[PDB]
Amino acid sequence: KVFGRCELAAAMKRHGLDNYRGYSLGNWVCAAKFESNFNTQATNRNTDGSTDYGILQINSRWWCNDGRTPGSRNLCNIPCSALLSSDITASVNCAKKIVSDGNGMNAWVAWRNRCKGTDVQAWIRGCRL
Numbered sequence: 636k637v638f639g640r641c642e643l644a645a646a647m648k649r650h651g652l653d654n655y656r657g658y659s660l661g662n663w664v665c666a667a668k669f670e671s672n673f674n675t676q677a678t679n680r681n682t683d684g685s686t687d688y689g690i691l692q693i694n695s696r697w698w699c700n701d702g703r704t705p706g707s708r709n710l711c712n713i714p715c716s717a718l719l720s721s722d723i724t725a726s727v728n729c730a731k732k733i734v735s736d737g738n739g740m741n742a743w744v745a746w747r748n749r750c751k752g753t754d755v756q757a758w759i760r761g762c763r764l
């Protein structure tokens with residue numbers, strides 16, 4: 636599923652991401668935009684052989700099992716394919732664990748390079764929320 640901007644903002648809000656560990660909703664929408672272009676089906680291979688999955692590009696190196704990332708962890712206790720559903724529940728719940736692990740949203744490369752320190756409120760402009 637490719638979400639609209641305000642559609643994703645609403646889904647993220649209902650799932651408890653607005654101000655989760657102090658990160659406003661706009662941060663999460665911005666991160667999803669630049670990680671997956673709002674596409675739940677997005678997958679991308681990393682140089683180490685792990686893969687990033689879904690709307691928030693969650694990586695198999697630490698967070699999920701994709702059956703092809705040897706010597707990795709599965710800290711969200713999920714198959715990576717779960718992160719590809721049209722419904723974002725699994726991605727959100729796993730993201731909450733990631734953002735809580737010590738590094739905050741810096742875990743998301745796209746967030747650190749494209750959202751951090753910008754006017755992220757713009758990402759929810761005009762959205763009925």
Ligand SMILES: [Ag+]
Pocket residue numbers: 646650722723724
């Ligand atoms: Ag949902």
Ligand code: NA
Pocket residue numbers: 676677678679
């Ligand atoms: Na893909």
Ligand code: NA
Pocket residue numbers: 684685686695701703704
């Ligand atoms: Na992989």
Ligand code: NA
Pocket residue numbers: 688689690691692693718726
């Ligand atoms: Na994801």
Ligand code: NA
Pocket residue numbers: 695696697698699700701704707708709
């Ligand atoms: Na893994």
Ligand code: NA
Pocket residue numbers: 748749
């Ligand atoms: Na940018």
